């Protein structure tokens, strides 16, 4: 299947890697990325718990909310990391690590 990563709007920052691999983007996760991940997951677990009290399923509701939050937070962190590696988001740390390795 022929592919093309080229975006409509060009990256406004140094392009460290045009099409970074999945594991490379995951390994690029920063402290802020983990903070976003953890915040989304914790809020989602909390909403699951609180909305589960009335039907009596606070634990299962907690697991469901936590799964939704885990998927959403991982997707958000991946979004940010890959955008930094691709030059779409401000990527000072990516460029500093790239110019050295």
């Amino acid at each position: 299947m022929n592919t093309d990563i080229t975006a409509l709007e060009k990256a406004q920052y140094p392009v460290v890697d045009r099409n970074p691999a999945f594991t490379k983007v995951v390994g690029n996760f920063s402290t802020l990325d983990y903070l976003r991940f953890s915040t989304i997951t914790g809020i989602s677990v909390t909403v699951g718990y609180l909305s589960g009290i009335k039907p009596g399923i606070k634990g299962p509701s907690m697991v469901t909310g936590g799964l939704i939050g885990l998927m959403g937070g991982f997707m958000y962190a991946y979004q940010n990391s890959a955008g930094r590696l691709m030059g779409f988001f401000p990527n000072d740390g990516e460029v500093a690590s790239y110019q050295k390795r």
Binding site: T31, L35, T39, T41, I43, M62
Partner: peptide, 29 residues
């Protein structure tokens, strides 16, 4: 002496994690 409801304790941990994480999120952006 001890809070027994485990699911309540995990929910408390999640709420604390969310609060500390939001504070860190502001502090690092």
């Amino acid at each position: 002496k001890v809070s027994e409801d485990k699911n309540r304790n995990y929910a408390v941990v999640a709420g604390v994690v969310a609060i500390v994480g939001s504070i860190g999120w502001y502090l690092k952006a």
